[PDB]
Amino acid sequence: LALRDVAARQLANATKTVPQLRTITPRWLVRLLHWTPVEAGIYRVNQVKDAFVDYIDNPREYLLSAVNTVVDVHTRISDLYSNPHDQIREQLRLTIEIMKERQESELINSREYGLLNNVAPGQLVHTRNGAPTPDDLDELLIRVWKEPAFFLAHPQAIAAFGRECTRRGVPPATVSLFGSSFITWRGVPLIPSDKVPLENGKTKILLLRVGESRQGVVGLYQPNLPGEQGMGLSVRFMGINRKALASYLVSLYCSLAVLTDDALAVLDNVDVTQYHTYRY
Amino acid sequence: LALRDVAARQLANATKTVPQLRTITPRWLVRLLHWTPVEAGIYRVNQVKDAFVDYIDNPREYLLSAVNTVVDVHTRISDLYSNPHDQIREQLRLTIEIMKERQESELINSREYGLLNNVAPGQLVHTRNGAPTPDDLDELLIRVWKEPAFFLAHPQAIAAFGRECTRRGVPPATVSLFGSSFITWRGVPLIPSDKVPLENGKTKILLLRVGESRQGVVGLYQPNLPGEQGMGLSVRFMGINRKALASYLVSLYCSLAVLTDDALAVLDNVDVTQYHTYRY
Amino acid sequence: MGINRKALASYLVSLYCSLAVLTDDALAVLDNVDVTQYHTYRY
């Protein structure tokens, strides 16, 4: 008999990871958008009227929106347990991750801005038979034929499109972006995002042109913020309350503008639950 | 509601102490002895016969004794759990502490060497009334009147002597040695040691002269050992067995010689259980 | 490890390893995969 493992383990330093947040996503849409700074929170998109040359007198003004989160950390927790990991920094990091996920979801789904609600008449396409076939994506590419950037879809919709391509004996090509592989259709990549709504096996697929040089989709943000930690993101210390809770304010200022109406098209009534039966 | 202490504690490094060994003692006797090296494990104490000048022809030869301890440490324990504390080093350190305690106990109590058994006739004093009074220590000082070094006693016997001194209205003086205070009697310090036997409230008190220049008590040790880590102490790696247990041999070589017989005296029948009743 | 009485030298080979799945959506398993099916091509 000798020294046991459980007793010798009382002398050993455990390697501790930072807390793993499983709802973190790559947030591809934010990385693929072009971001325009708005120095005073107002973006006015002037338009040619009925494209002599006249302009409309009531152009849409985009107001940047504010989302705030208060992060409360007890002073004794950050005082006592900040070795080897800063407790305040981990709380803030995680908080900002959750806020960035919410920001991507708002870029897709917001009622004021938000791609699925700012789609022009004539740019809304419907599937012929529910499932996202190659013909439906060809329709989408008809609607955004001027230099389309990427498709945006739920990963289940990308799988359904892959099944439809397999049934027709068509293997779609792939591209590498940001060290990851994506399906492409007619050279246009299919980008996954779990923020595209999926309810009762029904979802939507978006097609986007991005950039200000083109007349595409642009993201908007506020450029010079006190306590800035990122694009349109700021962190401020709010103070300490009577119960020794230190508070931090995390602010995110963002919006989205579709500069011209042929920069965005949406394929509606996409069914992701259809499976083919292969019989020979 | 905010982040709780129990959850935030999962990120914090705990400060781990080395294992505390409560049986560790200051081992004052070993620190107070003079240590003589014996290069080949044999110490022959020559004596003048019946002190012309003749020597005895059968002098006592002191053979250094060996105490061995095998320290088994599983290779996976030292491989896995040696951060930030070396597991083998802690096991060896603790093992050597226990062996040093045993060595002090053997210097006092051994049957071959050992002060309580190598006491000459005429140097054994008995208490007049059980309790260790000032008169009994004066008797001891009669027996070792030539430059006595220190008393050695159980801490309960030192307390009993203190009680006897208090009953007689005598406060004994104290000296500082090694950063610690000790009672002294007639300028001779009383050194505590829990290795002095105490059974049924009965113990002994020793008085020693030390050194080779004087003809006192000397400790003996072996000076040039393979794997030497201390005085007469060595550590050797023995090998690994089939079940991946690494073994280490800890060896301690020691003995003790009383050069002349008036260098040591023992006060016998010391009673440590007597308490005076103060009535006025 | 050392040499025994019959002049056999021993060596200890140790391997320390484990594996962690940090989040649960990092791993998926497809079960009941059948590898014995062959199609009959008739035209």
Side-chain angles (χ1 to χ4, degrees):
Chain A
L1 213 66
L3 177 72
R4 39 180 178 156
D5 296 289
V6 49
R9 218 169 287 133
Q10 298 315 112
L11 271 43
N13 273 344
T15 301
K16 268 84 80 170
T17 83
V18 306
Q20 307 297 107
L21 183 59
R22 72 155 314 196
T23 55
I24 291 183
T25 69
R27 299 182 309 259
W28 294 124
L29 169 62
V30 175
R31 210 184 309 192
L32 286 174
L33 282 177
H34 293 201
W35 288 95
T36 306
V38 187
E39 9 233 9
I42 309 170
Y43 194 70
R44 176 192 292 159
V45 175
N46 288 304
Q47 293 188 334
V48 171
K49 189 168 71 176
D50 291 331
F52 71 101
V53 173
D54 201 11
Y55 318 131
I56 73 176
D57 56 7
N58 57 332
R60 184 163 173 188
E61 288 196 332
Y62 293 83
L63 302 179
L64 288 173
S65 66
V67 269
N68 288 310
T69 298
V70 178
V71 183
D72 295 353
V73 183
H74 205 294
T75 52
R76 79 170 178 269
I77 279 181
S78 51
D79 276 331
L80 289 173
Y81 309 127
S82 294
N83 198 301
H85 297 123
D86 201 298
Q87 294 275 344
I88 296 166
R89 175 72 259 182
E90 290 300 335
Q91 209 81 348
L92 285 169
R93 186 184 63 80
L94 296 175
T95 292
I96 291 171
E97 295 290 333
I98 297 165
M99 290 190 85
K100 284 186 196 305
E101 305 292 326
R102 183 59 186 177
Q103 172 195 36
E104 176 198 31
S105 172
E106 284 301 275
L107 291 171
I108 291 165
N109 297 297
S110 176
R111 291 295 275 173
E112 175 62 9
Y113 60 101
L115 300 156
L116 284 189
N117 289 118
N118 291 267
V119 72
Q123 298 289 281
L124 177 71
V125 187
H126 283 256
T127 53
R128 306 179 66 83
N129 300 103
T133 64
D135 295 5
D136 307 316
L137 268 64
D138 277 325
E139 288 296 321
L140 269 193
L141 283 163
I142 292 176
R143 300 303 196 280
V144 196
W145 74 268
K146 301 174 199 171
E147 312 182 356
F150 57 90
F151 293 99
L152 195 70
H154 199 274
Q156 288 186 51
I158 295 174
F161 171 73
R163 291 200 302 279
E164 289 311 317
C165 283
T166 290
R167 184 73 219 85
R168 283 157 185 80
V170 190
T174 63
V175 295
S176 293
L177 302 170
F178 312 108
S180 189
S181 315
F182 301 95
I183 283 309
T184 73
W185 186 247
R186 316 296 193 201
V188 178
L190 277 75
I191 304 299
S193 179
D194 60 327
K195 301 313 181 296
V196 179
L198 192 149
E199 287 87 12
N200 305 8
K202 292 283 180 306
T203 191
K204 291 171 178 184
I205 296 174
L206 298 82
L207 182 60
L208 277 82
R209 176 206 323 136
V210 301
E212 282 175 329
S213 85
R214 283 86 68 193
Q215 292 166 332
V217 178
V218 290
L220 311 162
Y221 77 97
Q222 179 67 237
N224 310 288
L225 297 163
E228 182 170 90
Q229 312 280 19
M231 185 182 59
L233 168 77
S234 70
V235 177
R236 302 194 219 203
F237 176 67
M238 312 168 51
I240 305 167
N241 74 346
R242 305 291 289 196
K243 280 106 187 160
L245 263 165
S247 286
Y248 295 82
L249 183 76
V250 189
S251 296
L252 187 50
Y253 303 98
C254 174
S255 179
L256 183 141
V258 186
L259 290 174
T260 47
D261 62 279
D262 60 54
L264 168 70
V266 176
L267 177 65
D268 188 34
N269 216 88
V270 176
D271 192 355
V272 303
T273 70
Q274 284 168 23
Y275 290 87
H276 289 278
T277 295
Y278 292 84
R279 98 184 296 199
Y280 299 92
Chain B
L1 213 66
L3 177 72
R4 39 180 178 156
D5 296 289
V6 49
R9 218 169 287 133
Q10 298 315 112
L11 271 43
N13 273 344
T15 301
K16 268 84 80 170
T17 83
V18 306
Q20 307 297 107
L21 183 59
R22 72 155 314 196
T23 55
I24 291 183
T25 69
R27 299 182 309 259
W28 294 124
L29 169 62
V30 175
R31 210 184 309 192
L32 286 174
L33 282 177
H34 293 201
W35 288 95
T36 306
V38 187
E39 9 233 9
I42 309 170
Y43 194 70
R44 176 192 292 159
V45 175
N46 288 304
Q47 293 188 334
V48 171
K49 189 168 71 176
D50 291 331
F52 71 101
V53 173
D54 201 11
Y55 318 131
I56 73 176
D57 56 7
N58 57 332
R60 184 163 173 188
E61 288 196 332
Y62 293 83
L63 302 179
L64 288 173
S65 66
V67 269
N68 288 311
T69 298
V70 178
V71 183
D72 295 353
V73 183
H74 205 294
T75 52
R76 79 170 178 269
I77 279 181
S78 51
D79 276 331
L80 289 173
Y81 309 127
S82 294
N83 198 301
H85 297 123
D86 201 298
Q87 294 275 344
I88 296 166
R89 175 72 259 182
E90 290 300 335
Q91 209 81 348
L92 285 169
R93 186 184 63 80
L94 296 175
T95 292
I96 291 171
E97 295 290 333
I98 297 165
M99 290 190 85
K100 284 186 196 305
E101 305 292 326
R102 183 59 186 177
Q103 172 195 36
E104 176 198 31
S105 172
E106 284 301 275
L107 291 171
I108 291 165
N109 297 297
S110 176
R111 291 295 275 173
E112 175 62 9
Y113 60 101
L115 300 156
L116 284 189
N117 289 118
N118 291 267
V119 72
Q123 298 289 281
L124 177 71
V125 187
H126 283 256
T127 53
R128 306 179 66 83
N129 300 103
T133 64
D135 295 5
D136 307 316
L137 268 64
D138 277 325
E139 288 296 321
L140 269 193
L141 283 163
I142 292 176
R143 300 303 196 280
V144 196
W145 74 268
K146 301 174 199 171
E147 312 182 356
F150 57 90
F151 293 99
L152 195 70
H154 199 274
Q156 288 186 51
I158 295 174
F161 171 73
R163 291 200 302 279
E164 289 311 317
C165 283
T166 290
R167 184 73 219 85
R168 283 157 185 80
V170 190
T174 63
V175 295
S176 293
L177 302 170
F178 312 108
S180 189
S181 315
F182 301 95
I183 283 309
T184 73
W185 186 247
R186 316 296 193 201
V188 178
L190 277 75
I191 304 299
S193 179
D194 60 327
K195 301 313 181 296
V196 179
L198 192 149
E199 287 87 12
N200 305 8
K202 292 283 180 306
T203 191
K204 291 171 178 184
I205 296 174
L206 298 82
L207 182 60
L208 277 82
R209 176 206 323 136
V210 301
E212 282 175 329
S213 85
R214 283 86 68 193
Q215 292 166 332
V217 178
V218 290
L220 311 162
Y221 77 97
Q222 179 67 237
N224 310 288
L225 297 163
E228 182 170 90
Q229 312 280 19
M231 185 182 59
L233 168 77
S234 70
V235 177
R236 302 194 219 203
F237 176 67
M238 312 168 51
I240 305 167
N241 74 346
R242 305 291 289 196
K243 280 106 187 160
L245 263 165
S247 286
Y248 295 82
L249 183 76
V250 189
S251 296
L252 187 50
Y253 303 98
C254 174
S255 179
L256 183 141
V258 186
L259 290 174
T260 47
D261 62 279
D262 60 54
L264 168 70
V266 176
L267 177 65
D268 188 34
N269 216 88
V270 176
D271 192 355
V272 303
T273 70
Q274 284 168 23
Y275 290 87
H276 289 278
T277 295
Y278 292 84
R279 98 184 296 199
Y280 299 92
Chain C
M1 312 168 51
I3 305 167
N4 74 346
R5 305 291 289 196
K6 280 106 187 160
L8 263 165
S10 286
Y11 295 82
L12 183 76
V13 189
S14 296
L15 187 50
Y16 303 98
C17 174
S18 179
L19 183 141
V21 186
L22 290 174
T23 47
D24 62 279
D25 60 54
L27 168 70
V29 176
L30 177 65
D31 188 34
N32 216 88
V33 176
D34 192 355
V35 303
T36 70
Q37 284 168 23
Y38 290 87
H39 289 278
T40 295
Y41 292 84
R42 98 184 296 199
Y43 299 92

